[model samples]
Target chain A: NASVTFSYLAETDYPVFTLGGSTADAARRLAASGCACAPVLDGERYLGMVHLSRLLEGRKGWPTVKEKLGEELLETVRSYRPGEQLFDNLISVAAAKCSVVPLADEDGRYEGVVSRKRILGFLAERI
Target chain B: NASVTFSYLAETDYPVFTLGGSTADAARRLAASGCACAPVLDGERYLGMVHLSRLLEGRKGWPTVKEKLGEELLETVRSYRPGEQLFDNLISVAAAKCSVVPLADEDGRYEGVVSRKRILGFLAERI
Candidate 1:
């Protein structure tokens, strides 16, 4: 059977949180996204994921926390190359539950994200 | 290849919200659990899932709502049998993105929950 690629399962559009944006606003954004986390970017470069908890934490104690340039969000994930077989990155995706698996290239350009729902759905069909 | 069973990928214990318990309490619980949602139950019988957003929504307007027995959560998911092949249920799991997959018997008895991480990891290995 021919294998599926990450691009086949990815959604090319999602709201990206710029590195210096308000995390208070980000709390609302991530809470509504239906995913546990979203990708952070420094202009065109992918930084890491910002979990909702981290965003909400900033909202709680430090009103000023959301105003400054972003601090490290801590949950780091490697970007899944869009052209590769989905089979190559099951372990990484599994570890990223409640969040979308980011798709990029060797150059770290952001493409989009792949949900576990789609990946498992794909496997359910082909396997 | 020998197929992996749902039981092999499931965690037998997770904090469950009872039907009559505080949804406010549940909001805090789900937020801290590092999961998008958790199972709601009535004694040993599994009901459905309560998402964090639903719980938080109740917190905004209806404080008395949380004190009440329970309301419908709307995101219904089927239970995976422990003994079945993991391949038999990929579509269902994918549809269940942020929440853990529930495991039960045909009798509707509650068993456990399976994370996407473990299931995908299992696939990453076996595939």
Candidate 2:
């Protein structure tokens, strides 16, 4: 029986991206981080996530002019409260466009992250 | 709860790479497939998997001049018998470097793939 919530699955060590920065900078940082995708933040609030391919697409010859925010090509991020039941949203998280799922607090601010691997790891313990 | 074996998680739709093929050719197909990584085969038997980054590393520069076989870019894959308990290997599968887990039959032939996403999906149903 697996009764853990997203609280246990959420992790803090992965990289986080800012809402407005050089797309090129984000892409480089993303490449260095080696994560499949990373969450974006607008000041203190969680915004969305940018996958490596999406960020790379944003950086092509069509790279935006004037060092604008790395916009577009972001996953329509969905956040879950830490206390929520993990299984309640497990399928949606598993089916997410990006493999990582975001966590938010009562104030709807970023809390941490839960990835497909993390979810599988959780299942591993109880299965 | 969450008792399904690898038998249920196994899927056949994803792409599988081959043991002998031009490295360039494999890289192109890997890019087009949109999968995180794919399984490699030595004929009907599962050899391992090649991550996109690893495959790219193999194709870098003069790029294995003279069209050599794609090698050295595969995960040290461990296959599971379809009838085995998914839980026993759930941690290993989740912790796998390449994110996808391979399944095989009693004779050690490739069965299908069970990726992190699919494992999460399974937990979703039971959780």
Candidate 3:
């Protein structure tokens, strides 16, 4: 028999803030309905995103009407297939400094945001 | 030679931040000198951009700031170009999910943050 050891991955333990729950209520409502600094969510699921800075720049608060923001909303987020290589993922995230990237199925539903800091932190801990 | 590769190579290694700063400081310093996160400088050499993020996060009552916490203060950052073949840079930072990617000069001086939404908007507008 060969020896086998289990190693924990932080991605499994990372936290997620939902669309209309989880994060602070104000942050949540703002995010759900579209607060500038608030995150974007579709009922606990994240569908790409937009950030507060973008909101502040546009001088618009979270507008329930998507049309008000025009194309500025996070309409076309970048994505990668699951089980994607780590280096390519690193290059992808580093390019945009994205706070989160989700994994998706062919149907284009949410899976999870890869934990970049946790991944790096895990490596740092190992090293 | 019939042709040259005239398409721009974006990362001539665009901009950088420094050890101390060039960003606004004190909020009290003149617009010319208002406590800049300022641009970094070793007698006029650039390093990387350190926004108030690291500083705000490291408020454990500081008598001194080590390169440790400060190092997270963007001791190193992504460098790009004036030409904007930054889609890759976009992917890197976007993976963990970042919004801004800086373009650097050969010496690592700060140029500017790329607009994620704007880039997508450009494509959307075109299509």
Candidate 4:
């Protein structure tokens, strides 16, 4: 009963933010959106993700916060291809790191994210 | 190959926070810990987890922050019993919510957390 492909399990239209603004601004955007984290972008390339935890504790002040967050940015990102098995492979891999799993295409282009919400939501219905 | 048990996969020494004090104080603790989220506690009872995104938007001010965060506290929590299979069952379920998976016993007592880091780390070594 545990067989689901990530292609059907992932959400393809999740929110993503660019790393152009100040860290405070980025924090504001994440807060307003009510998402735990937002994937950062550089053009079409996947830069990394910014979690709200990085912005807390007075870690503000324009470039400084930006720099600090850059250091704290997710360097070792984990993602999965669309056709992979969600339950068999991707689920455990996705669980290891970010809650949002970036779904990439054959050319390694950013398609969208598969949030933990959808993955667990699907499991909740069955288990 | 994708048959790890949650009891073995989940890290049992993870941190947890109580729902006391101001929301600002809670945010500080989360930030200092360098964790994206921390499960809140009411003594030994599992209150819910607090995500850093909840405190990013000036959502503070002592009682006000406390009340607001109270509303934002995870109401529909998703966790697994210790004996559940990690890759086969718990991974998909755990992926749907907080990155930190709170492991509870048969009596529903808090038994620490199972982080996504270790879950994925295990997968990374194999896959």
Name the candidate that leads on TM-score: 1
After superposition, candidate 3 runs with Cα above 4 Å error: A1-17, A20-39, A58-72, A81-100, A106-109, A115-127, B1-39, B47-51, B58-127
| Candidate 3: tens digits of C-alpha lDDT, residues A53-99 | 34333332222333233233543576554545544345455444343
lDDT for each residue of candidate 3 in B1-127, tens digit (9 for 90 to 100): 1121112322223233445443223111111121113233344444554443344333321113333223445535554656544333334534322333455556655555553433432322322
lDDT of 2 by residue, A52-94 (tens): 6665453322235455454565675789999998766767888
The local lDDT score (0 to 100) that residue A70 gets in candidate 4 is: 56
Per the 3 Å backbone cut-off, how many clashing residue pairs does candidate 4 have? 5
Q: Residue-wise lDDT of candidate 2 within B1-127, one digit each (tens)? A: 4356887878888878777766655544544444557888888988888765665442222224355445566775788888888776777888887677888888879999877877776667766
Over the stretch B1-127, how does candidate 1's per-residue lDDT look in tens digits? 4576888877966877788888666765555555668887778877787777665562432234436437575355677888988776677777774557777888877898887767777777777
The deviation in Å at residue A105 for candidate 1 is: 3.2
Model 1's CAPRI class is acceptable
Which stretches in model 4 have alpha-carbon errors above 4 Å?
Answer: A1-6, A31-36, A53-96, A104-109, A116-127, B1-6, B31-36, B53-96, B106-108, B115-127
Off by over 4 Å in 2: A1-3, A24-34, A56-69, B1-4, B28-34, B56-69
Pairs of residues clashing in candidate 4: A96-B116, A96-B120, A116-B95, A116-B96, B6-B86
| Alpha carbon lDDT of each predicted model | 0.69, 0.71, 0.38, 0.60
- Per-residue error at B80 for model 2, in Å? 1.3
Q: What DockQ does candidate 1 have relative to the true complex?
A: 0.46
Instruction: Assess candidate 4 and give its TM-score to the true structure.
Output: 0.62
TM, every model: 0.84, 0.78, 0.37, 0.62
